[PDB]
C-alpha cells in the first residue's frame, strides 16, 4: 500500500548522458548507438539566442568543434547535422550501455521521468506529465538543457523529452528526440507565454481511483452524473473535457473498485465545487493530475 | 528553475538488486562486494509471522535453501547469518556493479531515495524521508520487502534502509542495513501503531526558503518571531520543535535569500494559523516537509 510520484529506475538513462561543449557552451547529450544528441543552442553566444539564424550559425561549426565528453573518456565527433531543433552529432563509437530504445512523441497528460543533468553528470530523477499548454514543470538550471524524458516499458526506454526552454514564468519547454517542440515554442530568448494550465482530468480520476485502492475514501459521495454535465464543471474550473476515451481508459480501475468511472466523476464534481475542506487524498491537499491511468495500474500491481 | 521531489539517480542501486527466494516466499536483496542482504522474514511462512522465532527457523535453513538470482543467473550462497533482522548470505561471486557504499543509519527528518523493486527488479524510485515517528510513507506491495532507501554523495551509496513492514494504518517500517528497525517497530504480524506524524520543521523552512528562491513569494510577510514563540506554535501544530542546531543548518539558504531565519519562522507561524487560503507554495497546497535544507541546497545548486 501507499502510492507515491514514482520515476522510472534511471539506469539504462544514466547510460547514455553525456557532456557536449561548443566554445564556452557546456550541456548536455544523449548518446544512442554512434549518434549523441543535443539542443541546437549548444552552437548559440548568449548574444546569439536573442535572434539566432540557426543554419548560418552551424556553417561556423566543424566536427572538432563539438566536444563530446563521456564520462572523463572524449568521443571523435565523425559527422553533425540539424534535425528541427536538435543537434546529431555522429560519433565513432557506439555506446556499450546502449538500451534498447525508441523516439516517442507524446499527448498532452502523458507522463515521463526527468533525468536532470549537468555537465553530462546526472543529479536526479522526478517525475513530469506534458502539460496541456505543451509546457511541463520541471527543475532544470543552467546546464540541464540537453536532460532528457523517457517511458520504460520493461527493457525498452522511450524517449519523449529532451530539455530546451525556461519560460520567463519559470516553466518549461522542450523537443522530442526528433528536435520538434512540444507546442508553439521556439529556441529563442523572445516573448513566449504559456496558455492555460488545464488540469488533467482523466489523470485526476486516476488518482482518485488509486486513493480508493489506498484506502482513502472520504470523498465517495452518493452522486453520479453524466459526461455533458460533469464537463459543464470541468469547463468551469480549467479542466481539460472527459471523452468516452477517458471514460474506457479508466475501465481497468473502475473493475477493480467496483466504482463506476461516472460515480467517481461526480465525487471530482463535489471537490471541484466543495474543495477539500482541510483535508488530504494520499497526502495531497490539492487534486494531482500527474499520474496516467496507466501509472495507477502499474504502481497500484508492481510491474518491472 | 522549478523544485521538484527529486530522487538520486538509481543506477548504483539497480546494479545491486537480487531475487531471494527461501521456501516458497520471494523478495528482494542487496548485493555488495560478496554479501547478499536481504530482510530474516524470507525465511517465515504467513504461519510463521504472528509469532516468528527467527533463531529456531533458521536452524532449519541452509545455504541451499537460500535462492539468490540476479537477473536470470544464479549466484551460490557458500554462507548465511543472521545480524538483527537482517540475513547476510555470503556467495562466491562479488557482485562486479557494486559502487562505492557505506551503511548509514539516519535521524527522523533526514530524507533519503527509495528503488522500489519486485522479484530483483526495479519497477520506481521515489524520495521519503524518516518520519519523527519512525515510519516512512512509501509505496510497497507484497514482494517490495529488501527494496533499499539511499542518499548518493558524488560516487558513494549510503544505504539508509531496507524494507520490511507494512502497519495496518498503511505506513512503512524497516531496518538500517545491519537490521535494526528504525523506531519500536519488530518484523511480527502483531499490533503495532505508530506514534504521532509531528512535521518536519527545519525541513518545511527549508521547502520555503526554495520558494522565495523559485519566485513563489506571496507567504513573506512583514513579521518576525523568536525561537521559544515560534515553539509554542509548533507545539500546537504538531510540529518538531526548532533548535539554534535547525536555525544553523538554514544558515545557508538564509544567506542565499537575505531573509533571517526568524523572518522565514514568522511566515511559516502565519501560514500555520492562517492557512493558505487556496494559494499553493510550489505546485503545493499543504506545507511541504519531505526536502531537508542539505536537499534545497543541492537542488538550488545542481550538484552531481
Ligand atoms: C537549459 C540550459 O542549460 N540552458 C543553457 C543555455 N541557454 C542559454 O541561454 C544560452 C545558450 C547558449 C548561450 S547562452 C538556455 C538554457
Ligand atoms: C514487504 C513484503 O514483500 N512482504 C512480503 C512478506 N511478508 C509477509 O507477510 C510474509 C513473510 C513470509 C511469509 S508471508 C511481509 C511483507
New binding site residues.
Partial sequence: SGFRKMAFPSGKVEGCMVQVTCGT?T?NGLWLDDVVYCPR?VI???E??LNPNYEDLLIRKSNHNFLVQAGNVQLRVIGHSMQNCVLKLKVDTANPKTPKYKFVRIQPGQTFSVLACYNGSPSGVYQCAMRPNFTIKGS?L????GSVGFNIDYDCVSFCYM??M?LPTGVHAGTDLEGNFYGPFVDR?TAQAAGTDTTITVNVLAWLYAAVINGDRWFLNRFTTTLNDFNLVAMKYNYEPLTQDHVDILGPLSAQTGIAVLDMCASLKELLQNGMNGRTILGSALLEDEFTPFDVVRQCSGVT
Avoid: I, R, V
Fill in positions: 557552451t550541456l543552442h548559440c553566444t548568449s546569439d539566442m532544470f543552467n546546464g540541464s538543457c530539455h530546451h525556461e530568448q
